[PDB]
Design a protein around this ligand. Structure first.
Ligand SMILES: [Cl-]
Ligand SMILES: [Cl-]
Ligand SMILES: [Cl-]
Ligand SMILES: [Cl-]
Ligand SMILES: [Cl-]
Ligand SMILES: [Cl-]
Ligand SMILES: [Cl-]
Ligand SMILES: [Cl-]
Ligand code: NA
Ligand code: NA
Ligand code: NA
Ligand code: NA
Ligand code: NA
Ligand code: NA
Ligand code: NA
Ligand code: NA
Ligand code: NA
Ligand code: NA
Ligand code: NA
Ligand code: NA
Ligand code: NA
Ligand code: NA
Lengths: 217, 210, 211, 217
């Protein structure tokens, strides 16, 4: 028994790619077949399964509606058609056979790499607690996540707020996208009366984001 | 269905008894399997249905379940047991995996063998110079590698890489690469790589053109 | 060609100290200038013709020549003198720069204020959770930030970032972001950020879903 | 009143072209030498090109000669850097500056130029063993596998015949976006004279294989 995956490689976000799983020494229509992926340096994640002869399909929540597992018995081959590819789909994709107790035979895996495209950031609040747990000084900020390429710039209150601001250098995440945070310290007594808005400009994607940062209950 | 593996990693000596725990949320079923994954390889099945040992797997591996906990035991840890171990739960065609447990072998300290490689003549005709420092077959992994050029400490122009633990002697190897312009390489003389571990530092060096 | 060799590549000195940056020519002319570059800004010209002070530059900056060696002196280091300094050499229209010298200000130890930020409700609807730990206004830069989730030590799922030294108080700030699956975040309870510096460790924590 | 403003920087393909402009105010551009100076992220200043008053003579750093062209339009009070066959090392902030008092007295704020990644086979250089062992009879040799994109590469030695004592390290991501790794092996020094050592680097994304005979220097 041998399982051999092909078709992995470079792919554009939003693009499509189809993997094949070539089986030998057994007819795969008589077995549940699975796709399991492994992001670089991370753990195993089950992706999809196909049932024997009934061809019933099951999908993990992260890929359903984008991925489709199928099989062609005449070629003794299993397929994973992946469609709305995104940064989180970079992984080694294994097909494996379910026999008796669990997944007993595995292929060697096929690597899929989703490369980067121009993309404006998502900007989430770093919200101050209405209750100061730091003796009267509150920390707030904006988390600027998943943009490409550099750079972004951040201002607070359209330039009105400069004292106590720290906009960090961006970090390169594993997915190839950048992320940074910008923070400011203010008096807690100001949380009820002063509006704090971060303005993020990302010229490569022609995007600007304004985020009002409000205290959490 | 959710599986929670503990610990995320551990270090134990050869011959030690090791126990990986995996906690299901809704599992009245024995459908829990254990796999072993070595670097760059697909996982291998060890235990299935929580306690059946798969064919060819050594006898020191066994599985059990206590309540909502499923447990994998390696009764006498062997060096070739360096791996990441995964519990798996199989449902009405739905599968979930634990986050895994990395098992590293504790061995006796081994000082590294330190080599230093000048840039090759071939590479310099493209205008860049990489100096490579090799730490071979050492333990533990923790080490501090610094570069000096004409006795000046370098910052921001080197990158490290480390192998996974060796399946036979349980050591690591590590590379540190200094990257410089041809011009900077050609104007300085003494290149050294300093390897510090504990109370001992070893410096391997060369003089350009010698 | 002409080459400038700048020493040191970096240094740290206290306020009021005298700082001496040396730049050593390869073969030359007094066509040597000195520049100061602050983070995120173009270099500012300080000295030209090796010793002529540029208009408006404070008098504590001065330049000197001796043979092939050119020297920049800051007679009384001020906190706003944190910058990278560059010598420059001009030939028959050919120009070379030294590699620069980063000057960092030595100041008194300051323990950071440590804050911890749970992932926002907005982000969790995308399936990812970022926990953010802020070390605000501390010195020295060297610090060890570890993450714990339900008292288990985290490895390989966090990244740090550090500001440049502050131009007034000479401190640093540092962020550490732990990134988790929404599922993993919503199944654990205690999230803690441990900041170790010297003989002191400070742990800021929160319980998910509580305050 | 004197103001310098650079535009036209941004994302660019390796082998592609991009044109920067330097818009001048408060002085006549014909009366001064103009310079372009770049700065790679986190690194030092590097002079790139200059343009002469009235003779429009051009000078270039060796690294850009034949690829970059500085020009000037006196009617628009603007200076230009035309950049061709861009390469990863051209990623930088580009600053134009005015020649005043023998040096660069006014600078623009700079414009970021980012060269993104393209499929590329590695350059593979020898890590050569010294003929004289300085490690007690054991020699270390290897191959430096530099500047390929994307992952992965695989390495064997002597077409798989040499496996014992091999360490092929995990690839590192360089600042330029390209990957780099080394593969090394320890052997007896007495073998350096008689035994041939070839590393075989396969890079499937670019359909490239490199074999490098590593000889003692
Ligand atoms: Cl708003
Ligand atoms: Cl050592
Ligand atoms: Cl800068
Ligand atoms: Cl303090
Ligand atoms: Cl502290
Ligand atoms: Cl972890
Ligand atoms: Cl976790
Ligand atoms: Cl031979
Ligand atoms: Na990606
Ligand atoms: Na930035
Ligand atoms: Na950041
Ligand atoms: Na921007
Ligand atoms: Na042992
Ligand atoms: Na150097
Ligand atoms: Na030495
Ligand atoms: Na220099
Ligand atoms: Na700038
Ligand atoms: Na703790
Ligand atoms: Na992170
Ligand atoms: Na302590
Ligand atoms: Na030896
Ligand atoms: Na690789």
């Amino acid at each position: 028994v041998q399982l051999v995956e092909s078709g992995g490689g470079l792919v554009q976000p939003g693009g499509s790619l189809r993997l094949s799983c070539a089986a030998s020494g057994f007819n795969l229509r008589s077995y549940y077949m699975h796709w399991v992926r492994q992001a670089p340096g991370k753990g195993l994640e089950w992706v999809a399964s196909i049932s024997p002869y009934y061809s019933y399909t099951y999908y993990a929540d992260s890929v359903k509606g984008r991925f489709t597992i199928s099989a062609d018995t005449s070629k003794n081959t299993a397929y994973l058609q992946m469609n709305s590819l995104r940064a989180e789909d970079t992984a080694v994709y294994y097909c494996a056979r379910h026999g008796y107790g669990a997944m007993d035979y595995w292929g060697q895996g096929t690597l899929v790499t989703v490369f980067n495209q121009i993309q404006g950031p998502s900007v989430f609040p770093l919200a101050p607690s209405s209750k100061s747990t730091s003796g009267g000084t509150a920390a707030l900020g904006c988390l600027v996540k998943d943009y490409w390429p550099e750079p972004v710039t951040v201002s607070w209150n359209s330039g009105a707020l400069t004292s106590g601001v720290h906009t960090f250098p961006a970090v390169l995440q594993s997915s190839g996208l950048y992320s940074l945070s910008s923070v400011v310290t203010v008096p807690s007594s100001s949380l009820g009366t002063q509006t704090y808005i971060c303005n993020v400009n990302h010229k490569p994607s022609n995007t600007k984001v304004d985020k009002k940062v409000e205290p959490k209950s | 269905i959710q599986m929670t593996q503990s610990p995320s990693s551990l270090s134990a000596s050869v011959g030690d008894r090791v126990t990986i725990t995996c906690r299901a949320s809704q599992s009245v079923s024995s459908a829990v399997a254990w796999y072993q994954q070595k670097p760059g390889k697909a996982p291998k099945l060890l235990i299935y249905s929580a306690s059946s040992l798969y064919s060819g797997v050594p006898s020191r591996f066994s599985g059990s379940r206590s309540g909502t906990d499923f447990t994998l035991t390696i009764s006498s840890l062997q060096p070739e047991d360096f791996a990441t171990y995964y519990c798996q739960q199989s449902s009405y065609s739905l599968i979930t995996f634990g986050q895994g447990t990395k098992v590293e072998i504790k061995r006796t300290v081994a000082a590294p063998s330190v080599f230093i490689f000048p840039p090759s003549d071939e590479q310099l005709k493209s205008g860049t110079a990489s100096v490579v420092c090799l730490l071979n077959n050492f333990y533990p992994r923790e080490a501090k590698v610094s570069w000096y050029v004409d006795n000046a400490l370098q910052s921001g122009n080197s990158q490290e890489s480390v192998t996974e633990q060796d399946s036979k002697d349980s050591t690591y190897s590590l590379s540190s690469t200094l990257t410089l312009s041809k011009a900077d390489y050609e104007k300085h003389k003494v290149y050294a790589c300093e390897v510090t571990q504990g109370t001992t530092s070893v410096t391997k060096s060369f003089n350009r053109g010698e």
